[PDB]
Design a protein around this nucleic acid. Sequence first.
DNA 1: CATCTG
DNA 2: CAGATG
Length: 327
Amino acid sequence: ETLNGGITDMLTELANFEKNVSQAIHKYNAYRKAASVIAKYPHKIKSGAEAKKLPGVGTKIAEKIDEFLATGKLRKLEKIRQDDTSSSINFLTRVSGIGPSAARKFVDEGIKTLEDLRKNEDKLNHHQRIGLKYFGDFEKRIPREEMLQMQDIVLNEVKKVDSEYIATVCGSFRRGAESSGDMDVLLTHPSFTSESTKQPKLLHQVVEQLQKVHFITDTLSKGETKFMGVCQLPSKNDEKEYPHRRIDIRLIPKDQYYCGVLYFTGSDIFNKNMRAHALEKGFTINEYTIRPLGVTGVAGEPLPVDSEKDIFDYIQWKYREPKDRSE
DNA sequence: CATCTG
DNA sequence: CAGATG
Ligand SMILES: Nc1ccn([C@H]2CC[C@@H](COP(=O)(O)OP(=O)(O)OP(=O)(O)O)O2)c(=O)n1
Ligand SMILES: [Mn+2]
Ligand SMILES: [Mn+2]
Ligand code: NA
Ligand code: NA
């Protein structure tokens, strides 16, 4: 956790680059198990050979660990930090819409910067365009005090459209968090479930409402159940308009709201121990359901949940206020 | 995983 | 349809 921090980190840079610049997934994958093992490892790796000793740790990695331990640095790491090509790919990639794949193409065409991007707005698609338009705003975190106004909004219009809607703002917002990065809304309706055959309108009508009153400004992606957009809190009395914010909205069968709802609330960490404990308590849990684990090895059967309450209970746990879901 | 591009 | 993105 700090004993092998450097090593784990360099390995991480190294891993990252494989995947992003080069396309060495295998190699890339290599750095990752390595870092994961050297991460859990209890002592102070004093050398390469010491590390080699681990699974995941081969000769190459070992070599690296050595040079790194030997001197506060790594050549290859040094060479990568310079190389403008590598840097460019790391940067283009910040644009929502551009991944490595694409980060690669554009570079090979000469688009390496933001400007390049603007000039070549033609080669970009819709999402990327948006991303480009809001690069800045995209990176600003969401101050909790804003979230409240936002939540305040979605929740009223959702209501107006249908009294039966049930929206929940999950995420870190939901977890206490002073600021968050995106707004995720969970959505269900009594009239939408496991079996029931669809009702896309369910998701569409709200989306519309939101843009009706101008809270949603753009559409990144709109499906029958998942919507990815951009939104903004109405600028008050002209002087300080708000940044454009990322927002996702998801339709869920009413029969698996809470699992989902619970689940998005995270944190990853809160998740697992819950999952793990659930496993003890004789269960199973995922994004949509909880299930009584048979003994034959495994087994299913969607336990019936009417709250986050019904869940914990299952696993015979203490109901965790959202804040306390930290880990 | 669900959505988009091409 | 494979392949990309979040
Ligand atoms: N690959 C992933 C990503 C997320 N999650 C969970 C973690 C919380 C939830 C949605 O949260 P995000 O917006 O991804 O993150 P957050 O925890 O809300 O953090 P923030 O919004 O501050 O970035 O999904 C998961 O199980 N697996
Ligand atoms: Mn989030
Ligand atoms: Mn999200
Ligand atoms: Na990106
Ligand atoms: Na293939």
